[PDB]
Enzyme design. Sequence first.
Site, PDB file in Angstrom:
ATOM      1  N   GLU A  23      46.631  60.003  37.419  1.00  0.00           N
ATOM      2  CA  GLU A  23      48.081  60.254  37.341  1.00  0.00           C
ATOM      3  C   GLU A  23      48.904  59.114  38.176  1.00  0.00           C
ATOM      4  O   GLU A  23      48.581  58.699  39.233  1.00  0.00           O
ATOM      5  CB  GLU A  23      48.676  61.551  38.157  1.00  0.00           C
ATOM      6  CG  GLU A  23      49.979  62.049  37.794  1.00  0.00           C
ATOM      7  CD  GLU A  23      50.079  63.683  38.127  1.00  0.00           C
ATOM      8  OE1 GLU A  23      48.921  64.194  38.338  1.00  0.00           O
ATOM      9  OE2 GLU A  23      50.986  64.448  38.277  1.00  0.00           O
ATOM     10  N   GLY A  24      49.776  58.529  37.361  1.00  0.00           N
ATOM     11  CA  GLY A  24      50.449  57.105  37.665  1.00  0.00           C
ATOM     12  C   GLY A  24      51.886  57.654  38.322  1.00  0.00           C
ATOM     13  O   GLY A  24      52.023  58.643  39.054  1.00  0.00           O
ATOM     14  N   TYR A  26      55.245  57.557  37.223  1.00  0.00           N
ATOM     15  CA  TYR A  26      56.184  58.417  36.478  1.00  0.00           C
ATOM     16  C   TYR A  26      55.215  59.351  35.409  1.00  0.00           C
ATOM     17  O   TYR A  26      55.692  60.481  35.207  1.00  0.00           O
ATOM     18  CB  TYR A  26      57.444  57.915  35.930  1.00  0.00           C
ATOM     19  CG  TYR A  26      57.230  56.619  35.068  1.00  0.00           C
ATOM     20  CD1 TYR A  26      56.679  56.323  33.949  1.00  0.00           C
ATOM     21  CD2 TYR A  26      57.383  55.384  35.851  1.00  0.00           C
ATOM     22  CE1 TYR A  26      56.372  54.971  33.396  1.00  0.00           C
ATOM     23  CE2 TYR A  26      57.371  54.080  35.268  1.00  0.00           C
ATOM     24  CZ  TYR A  26      56.620  53.961  33.919  1.00  0.00           C
ATOM     25  OH  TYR A  26      56.468  52.792  33.318  1.00  0.00           O
ATOM     26  N   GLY A  27      54.322  58.806  34.637  1.00  0.00           N
ATOM     27  CA  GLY A  27      53.482  59.394  33.838  1.00  0.00           C
ATOM     28  C   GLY A  27      52.094  59.282  33.878  1.00  0.00           C
ATOM     29  O   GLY A  27      51.716  58.389  34.965  1.00  0.00           O
ATOM     30  N   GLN A  28      51.235  59.763  33.419  1.00  0.00           N
ATOM     31  CA  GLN A  28      49.653  59.907  33.513  1.00  0.00           C
ATOM     32  C   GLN A  28      49.294  58.658  32.870  1.00  0.00           C
ATOM     33  O   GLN A  28      49.704  58.420  31.849  1.00  0.00           O
ATOM     34  CB  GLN A  28      49.201  61.259  33.260  1.00  0.00           C
ATOM     35  CG  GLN A  28      49.371  62.229  34.127  1.00  0.00           C
ATOM     36  CD  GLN A  28      48.828  63.649  33.964  1.00  0.00           C
ATOM     37  OE1 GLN A  28      48.637  64.014  32.676  1.00  0.00           O
ATOM     38  NE2 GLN A  28      48.396  64.429  34.949  1.00  0.00           N
ATOM     39  N   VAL A  29      48.170  58.296  33.418  1.00  0.00           N
ATOM     40  CA  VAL A  29      47.403  56.728  33.195  1.00  0.00           C
ATOM     41  C   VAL A  29      46.372  57.282  31.952  1.00  0.00           C
ATOM     42  O   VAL A  29      45.415  58.122  32.549  1.00  0.00           O
ATOM     43  CB  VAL A  29      47.030  55.987  34.079  1.00  0.00           C
ATOM     44  CG1 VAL A  29      46.631  54.491  33.624  1.00  0.00           C
ATOM     45  CG2 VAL A  29      48.076  55.725  34.905  1.00  0.00           C
ATOM     46  N   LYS A  44      49.903  53.718  29.600  1.00  0.00           N
ATOM     47  CA  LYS A  44      50.811  54.545  30.286  1.00  0.00           C
ATOM     48  C   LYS A  44      51.978  54.806  29.249  1.00  0.00           C
ATOM     49  O   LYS A  44      52.458  53.941  28.617  1.00  0.00           O
ATOM     50  CB  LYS A  44      51.321  53.839  31.408  1.00  0.00           C
ATOM     51  CG  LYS A  44      51.685  54.800  32.645  1.00  0.00           C
ATOM     52  CD  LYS A  44      52.728  54.086  33.623  1.00  0.00           C
ATOM     53  CE  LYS A  44      52.906  54.812  34.577  1.00  0.00           C
ATOM     54  NZ  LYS A  44      53.525  54.087  35.823  1.00  0.00           N
ATOM     55  N   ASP A 105      37.621  47.990  36.835  1.00  0.00           N
ATOM     56  CA  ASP A 105      36.820  48.893  37.117  1.00  0.00           C
ATOM     57  C   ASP A 105      36.618  50.254  37.933  1.00  0.00           C
ATOM     58  O   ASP A 105      36.200  51.275  37.122  1.00  0.00           O
ATOM     59  CB  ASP A 105      35.213  47.803  37.344  1.00  0.00           C
ATOM     60  CG  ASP A 105      35.002  46.746  36.723  1.00  0.00           C
ATOM     61  OD1 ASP A 105      35.511  46.503  35.669  1.00  0.00           O
ATOM     62  OD2 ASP A 105      34.390  45.991  37.187  1.00  0.00           O
ATOM     63  N   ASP A 147      55.508  51.834  46.714  1.00  0.00           N
ATOM     64  CA  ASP A 147      54.162  52.841  46.551  1.00  0.00           C
ATOM     65  C   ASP A 147      52.931  52.324  46.609  1.00  0.00           C
ATOM     66  O   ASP A 147      52.113  52.301  45.660  1.00  0.00           O
ATOM     67  CB  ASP A 147      54.575  53.601  45.035  1.00  0.00           C
ATOM     68  CG  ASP A 147      53.660  54.665  44.963  1.00  0.00           C
ATOM     69  OD1 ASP A 147      53.330  55.432  45.963  1.00  0.00           O
ATOM     70  OD2 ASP A 147      53.477  55.365  43.830  1.00  0.00           O
TER      71      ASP A 147
HETATM   72  C1  LIG Z   1      49.115  51.158  36.034  1.00  0.00           C
HETATM   73  N1  LIG Z   1      47.631  50.634  35.839  1.00  0.00           N
HETATM   74  C2  LIG Z   1      46.675  51.198  36.206  1.00  0.00           C
HETATM   75  C3  LIG Z   1      45.688  50.502  35.685  1.00  0.00           C
HETATM   76  N2  LIG Z   1      44.147  50.753  35.572  1.00  0.00           N
HETATM   77  C4  LIG Z   1      43.389  50.061  35.425  1.00  0.00           C
HETATM   78  N3  LIG Z   1      42.153  50.480  35.493  1.00  0.00           N
HETATM   79  C5  LIG Z   1      42.288  51.623  36.245  1.00  0.00           C
HETATM   80  C6  LIG Z   1      41.395  52.657  36.909  1.00  0.00           C
HETATM   81  N4  LIG Z   1      40.002  52.476  36.662  1.00  0.00           N
HETATM   82  C7  LIG Z   1      39.143  53.485  37.816  1.00  0.00           C
HETATM   83  C8  LIG Z   1      38.771  54.777  37.186  1.00  0.00           C
HETATM   84  N5  LIG Z   1      39.108  55.816  37.459  1.00  0.00           N
HETATM   85  C9  LIG Z   1      38.767  56.770  36.548  1.00  0.00           C
HETATM   86  C10 LIG Z   1      38.698  58.276  36.682  1.00  0.00           C
HETATM   87  C11 LIG Z   1      38.326  59.042  35.603  1.00  0.00           C
HETATM   88 CL1  LIG Z   1      38.289  60.739  35.593  1.00  0.00          CL
HETATM   89  C12 LIG Z   1      37.817  58.232  34.504  1.00  0.00           C
HETATM   90 CL2  LIG Z   1      37.525  59.087  33.030  1.00  0.00          CL
HETATM   91  C13 LIG Z   1      37.921  56.726  34.318  1.00  0.00           C
HETATM   92  C14 LIG Z   1      38.487  56.217  35.513  1.00  0.00           C
HETATM   93  N6  LIG Z   1      38.484  54.697  35.761  1.00  0.00           N
HETATM   94  N7  LIG Z   1      42.154  53.552  37.616  1.00  0.00           N
HETATM   95  C15 LIG Z   1      43.427  53.720  37.617  1.00  0.00           C
HETATM   96  N8  LIG Z   1      44.009  54.826  38.417  1.00  0.00           N
HETATM   97  C16 LIG Z   1      45.307  55.424  37.878  1.00  0.00           C
HETATM   98  C17 LIG Z   1      46.083  56.473  38.917  1.00  0.00           C
HETATM   99  O1  LIG Z   1      45.329  57.337  39.535  1.00  0.00           O
HETATM  100  C18 LIG Z   1      43.969  57.095  39.737  1.00  0.00           C
HETATM  101  C19 LIG Z   1      43.354  55.827  39.196  1.00  0.00           C
HETATM  102  N9  LIG Z   1      44.051  52.758  36.965  1.00  0.00           N
HETATM  103  C20 LIG Z   1      43.705  51.861  36.527  1.00  0.00           C
HETATM  104  C21 LIG Z   1      46.236  49.332  35.264  1.00  0.00           C
HETATM  105  N10 LIG Z   1      47.477  49.588  35.241  1.00  0.00           N
END
Ligand SMILES: Cn1cc(-n2cnc3c(NCc4nc5cc(Cl)c(Cl)cc5[nH]4)nc(N4CCOCC4)nc32)cn1
Lengths: 332, 248, 826
Positions: A23-24, A26-29, A44, A105, A147
């Site tokens: 969850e980002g 304003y919307g989910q990532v 997003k 990663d 944030d």
């Molecule tokens: C706005 N913005 C985001 C990104 N961005 C790029 N890489 C990741 C990333 N990579 C680890 C990762 N966590 C994972 C969890 C699951 Cl359940 C799965 Cl299936 C695959 C996953 N990979 N995590 C995240 N988060 C977003 C919000 O809450 C938690 C983490 N944002 C990421 C680039 N721009």
Amino acid sequence: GQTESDWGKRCVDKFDIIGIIGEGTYGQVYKAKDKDTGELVALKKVRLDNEKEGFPITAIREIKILRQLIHRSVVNMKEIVTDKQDALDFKKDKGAFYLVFEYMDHDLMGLLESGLVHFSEDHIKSFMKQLMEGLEYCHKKNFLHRDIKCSNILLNNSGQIKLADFGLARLYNSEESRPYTNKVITLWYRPPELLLGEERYTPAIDVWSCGCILGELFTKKPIFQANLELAQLELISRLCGSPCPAVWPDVIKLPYFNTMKPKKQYRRRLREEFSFIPSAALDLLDHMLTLDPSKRCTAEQTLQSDFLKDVELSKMAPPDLPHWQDCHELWS
Amino acid sequence: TKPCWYWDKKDLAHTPSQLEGLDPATEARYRREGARFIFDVGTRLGLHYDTLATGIIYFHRFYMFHSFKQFPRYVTGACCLFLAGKVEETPKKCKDIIKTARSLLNDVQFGQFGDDPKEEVMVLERILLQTIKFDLQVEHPYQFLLKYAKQLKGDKNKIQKLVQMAWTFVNDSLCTTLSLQWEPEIIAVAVMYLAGRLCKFEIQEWTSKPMYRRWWEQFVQDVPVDVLEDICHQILDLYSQGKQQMPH
Amino acid sequence: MSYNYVVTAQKPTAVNGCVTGHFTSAEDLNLLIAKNTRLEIYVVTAEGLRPVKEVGMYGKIAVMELFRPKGESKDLLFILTAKYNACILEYKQSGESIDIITRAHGNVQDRIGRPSETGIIGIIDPECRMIGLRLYDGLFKVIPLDRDNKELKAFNIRLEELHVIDVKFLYGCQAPTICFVYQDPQGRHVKTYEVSLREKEFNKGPWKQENVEAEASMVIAVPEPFGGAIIIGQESITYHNGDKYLAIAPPIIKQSTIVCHNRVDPNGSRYLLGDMEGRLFMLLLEKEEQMDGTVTLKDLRVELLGETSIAECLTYLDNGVVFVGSRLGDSQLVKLNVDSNEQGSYVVAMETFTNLGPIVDMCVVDLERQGQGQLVTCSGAFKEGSLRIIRNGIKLHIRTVPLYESPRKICYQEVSQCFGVLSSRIEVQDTSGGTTALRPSASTQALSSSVSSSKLFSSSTAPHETSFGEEVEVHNLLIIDQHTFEVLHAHQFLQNEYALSLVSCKLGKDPNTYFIVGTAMVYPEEAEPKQGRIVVFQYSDGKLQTVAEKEVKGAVYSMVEFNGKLLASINSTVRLYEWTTEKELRTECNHYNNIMALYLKTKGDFILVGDLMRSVLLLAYKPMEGNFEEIARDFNPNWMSAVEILDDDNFLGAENAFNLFVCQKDSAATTDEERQHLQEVGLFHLGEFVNVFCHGSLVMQNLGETSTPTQGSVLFGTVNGMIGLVTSLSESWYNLLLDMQNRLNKVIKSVGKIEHSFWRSFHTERKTEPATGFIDGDLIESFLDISRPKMQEVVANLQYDDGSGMKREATADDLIKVVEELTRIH
Ligand SMILES: Cn1cc(-n2cnc3c(NCc4nc5cc(Cl)c(Cl)cc5[nH]4)nc(N4CCOCC4)nc32)cn1
């Protein structure tokens, strides 16, 4: 041309959606892979379905702010793609837009919340210097992330750190005092000035949040953990001292100063309760967690510290991730 | 070309015997028992001294690949001496070795040979030849002790006391793992080195370089004093442990 | 949104600690054995142990020490839990009713602090002046033992040395003095400090610091006659006291790591030592006494006594007996004889206490078609490895099948009337270049045996060099009869190949039932294995035949049968194989969005994926497209230890932080975001490490449909031997039983005055949340033990759902029927 100059004309059909990752702002990532290039990218969604105000203004901020920012420690918005464009009549198109980011990663939250990773002093130096170099870049461009949380701090297996979500990012101007939303940072990382109701805040709001992360890398546990703003201010007072006009002349200007009073007029116990932290880092932590935002250090000053001044980004000492066959059951 | 038959002292803690639960003192005891068993049996049969050591070296090498618990020590030692007889051209019949074994072993010890003592030995010959990799030619420090003493010139009686005392040290070193630790040439120099200190002899004077304080170098090259002191320490451990005293 | 119910079927059996003292009375010698969250009080007799009391605590017992302050008739008990709950307890007996009194209680957790590496350490001053706690790096917590300190308030003294290995309160010191071995980049050292309750700070210690062994393990507080301390390591044992320095280096202790110690003689003349291979040693302290003006240490001696169970704690009682408390195997009472037996051992076992030890895997099988069902578990490790067959007994009857090697995974194949067991034994590089086992085990004593002759990896340009003395793991597939439990066959896998997964099922249109093993090529240079095999065996006429092999580029952590297709997880990939008519595996579809796909569960076309992180994922095989599809994922990061599917909407998982949780799909919402969001609807701190979830129940199953309050049955085994049961409830039953818990908590007095809600609260090092969606069945079943006046307090104002459509108030006997019906699920 080309070279990511023309945006919005590419479709989301070129990306295969792997799944949702979190969850980002304003919307989910969601995470996806480009069909043509084969690169893993982070997307997003922007609805644009609400014909109330059309395109969301919080999304317009992240599009405007992110295209100006370019740094080794900032997630760069790659492009913007859209849904299928319906027929020859531009009126029938109800498709949404998608922001294309670079995929990392891991996330600091997942690494720390799982409890698998271990951070040495050299890892924290590689972590904090990259974190402060990127924050100094954006603060020089007069932007406020507002944030700073472990979920928006991304890491690659090489050791490179990047900041992610800028939907809650606004522009800062010292000359123009414009009121913003008082509650904006996660309660565990919210500065004391925002707890007391400061609506016109300084860029030092991110410095306090990153200070809570610096100490969180040494204890592997968030410093101040409370469910309410007043209870959060109490935990801050138990460590950094109660907000008082002696150490904080401008605390009286804050509205909730008389309203949100700590239990006692605590003395500062930050150096006492963090005696196990190296001397180079404790001096950095003490200034970053200073109550008065005018007395709180800046992003550049953290990079000019014995903890980070002589750190070289060429090393990039990656955080230790556990291996396998020596884990689980009775293995080692 | 030829296999390596030399380990380091630290490797002895990882023999198959050690790794099956046997303590270091027991394996060392089982080696001295097997060594003296091969020594006494072949002596009763009137065997040449090279034949005795060849079987003892076969015996020492065998339990570097196998455990004392899985192969009876006295059954193996008889097979080594039997093979050593055919190797060193001093053969004896297998029934003659079994007969001597019963003379020197009690009812408990002889039980290792089972119901058929001859068959338990003849069978083990296949595994012995495979374990020793058919590397039958073995040299012993005796011929080197004699090759080096002939080059010594001086008091004939003093040199003769040096040789017999060193020869005694070579016979005692067979009970140890020294056969596996160092080449036979170094052992022959070390027993000269030990007998020289006990007899208060200046061995350098009898050499072609009477001034060469490293008298051992003219015999065996590239030998530090640390090795000679290490070998002397191991031989003297038997004298202090057992009831025999140093020859002197 | 979800409602579940958890009961303990078998209490923890692994002994985590054992102490000797005078708790019940000043005359009796008591042995207080500590298992996970359980405290057993025994009385040492000439025949053995006499039970007196067993109490349950709302916390994992970490520190347990007996002390007797100035003015007390008998020793008091101090216990610090894993959640930092500290308390001082006293024994009270009024005839036949035995109750434990909480004299003092408190929580000594600091708001800020890095938890230490060597775990919680608890030491008490010889003069009983203070309680020393090492909870965080660079901090030494002191609880002053004053008569009025009933809240157990404490202060923290700053500690210069951040990385400490072990610490004890020294004997024979004028002022209270601590002795500790710490590790800095310059190696490990031993240092001393003087504690001042008045100044609340450290003063300079008596004797100086010296450079000690790099693998220094334990500190032993030598009593008053000799004084000082003894430092146990891997190769050397050293004694430090003032200017005196002693160092012994026996060659026997290098073979195995010493882990525990105990004093035989209270003056400190004799000490007990134990190895990882079960070997038992004796540390002897020689005296030089001349009109008592010296009593210095002449020398130290260690002698091998024999073999015991791999013990976590040793304690010498009276009359020559020692209690061997084991975590990896059965605990025992052993007799220490002056005479060696026919094998040269001075140790003879008296009694054997069954300990399920680490339950790595287990399967429920109704061997005798009784409707009851039996549970066969893989229990123990190394020499204590065994199989355990557990059944309901009309208590519990447990049969032990010793394996003498570590069991890994178990599966049952009725077609062959036998079990499949993955096992590993440890061999050491010998002088011949190969390896030699220390002891015979099931893989070597099999009736028939075979070795994989596969060249799948060919030379794989990886002829790693082996040095003498290096331990290697040899993995085998055991074929075990279901009646005799005799090792019918043992298949030894390739060199450096680990057996990780095992399944028994038919595949495709092939009628032959196969054993399939997923393996991995494990090398120390590899952080993540990059080679592996999925091999298919067929057991026919007492011999195992290699049917097919599939090369994979990673570790096959788990396999499962999926509608005649093989679902296997290879590193981050979750793959579905098809069993062709050519008797070979063929890849159909893949999923990659994982970190380390560990635990797998399937139901229909649904797939529950348990990864190392971030948690659990739902995969659906879409037969139309022929490819996987992610439905929803739990977004809160968790370190999973075992997953399980409860129903089509609820999922059960276990994390490394001793916590169970339940996720649920957000119904069938209209937003694509709500559906893809697995919401954690159940939280519960179990206190045990769950390794395997298993559907089934040991109770008699009545094909007649009976409206029972519980629906479903999930069994799980833990590291401490505890076996539990999870079941779902209706919303009416959940609110009814939950309201009883709040009434039972206000009534029942807990040991140490620990809040029940605090104990069962979800707890990691970073977050602590209250329990939800779970009914602590161990608290509900305690209703049949409280006195009648307390029952009326629980049933007062309580409104029941009597009959059909009526909200009538319940009688106390109405609640007794409810609890007794819930006691029939186990
Ligand atoms: C706005 N913005 C985001 C990104 N961005 C790029 N890489 C990741 C990333 N990579 C680890 C990762 N966590 C994972 C969890 C699951 Cl359940 C799965 Cl299936 C695959 C996953 N990979 N995590 C995240 N988060 C977003 C919000 O809450 C938690 C983490 N944002 C990421 C680039 N721009």
